[PDB]
Design a protein around this ligand. Sequence first.
Ligand SMILES: *C(=N)CNC(=O)CNC(=O)[C@@H](NC(=O)Cc1cc(Cl)cc(Cl)c1)[C@@H](C)O
Lengths: 11, 204
Amino acid sequence: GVKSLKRRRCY
Amino acid sequence: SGSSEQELAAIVRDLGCGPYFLGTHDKRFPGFLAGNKLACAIVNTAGRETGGVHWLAFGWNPRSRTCYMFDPFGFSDRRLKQIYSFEYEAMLRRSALALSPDRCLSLEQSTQTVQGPDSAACGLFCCMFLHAFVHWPDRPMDGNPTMNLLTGVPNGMLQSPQVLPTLRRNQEKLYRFLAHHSPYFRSHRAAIEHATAFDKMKQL
Ligand SMILES: *C(=N)CNC(=O)CNC(=O)[C@@H](NC(=O)Cc1cc(Cl)cc(Cl)c1)[C@@H](C)O
């Protein structure tokens, strides 16, 4: 499959 | 030119996504708000008024509080905004506020293209990622029986000759997978294959 990037987003 | 919303809705159902599917939308898709369940959508970069431009897939895994964003081209948010005038910050805000206790979510997205630069199969690769998403929502981007069939290559290499044969093979395997699991695809195959062609943008 595809390589991926995981980012944390707080609101 | 490409895939219509009716076409994609029928394929998504054929792939076993139906119970979790939120439908097809333009850039004003609200997000995952209804409840903290396994969910997905197919979203266009443009508003309905333009007629549509590019297809994207969004998944929500409640177990990890992850929003998966699949662009067949694996562009970055900055690059989706430059090229397609598309941003989905408000969507991630409405979702994290309505579904997560800590007001935080994890945003997981591809860094690699599976699609050729001239191809019109974006809607179709999106159906395929959603098949991988609904069966393996913990590991959907790679390492599962559906996404293992495709070869992701770095996004920065998208308009290079060395990767064209890898991306063409990916398009051939996209059709083989779909013909295998989707009666809608089988019945409309000649019209779909022609309209989503690997070299379709060069033949408008
Ligand atoms: C992919 N690489 C090629 N591009 C496309 O397949 C894009 N196709 C579309 O947008 C279709 N449009 C519609 O189905 C109408 C529509 C537009 C918007 Cl913004 C949202 C929704 Cl839900 C539907 C195609 C027929 O042009």
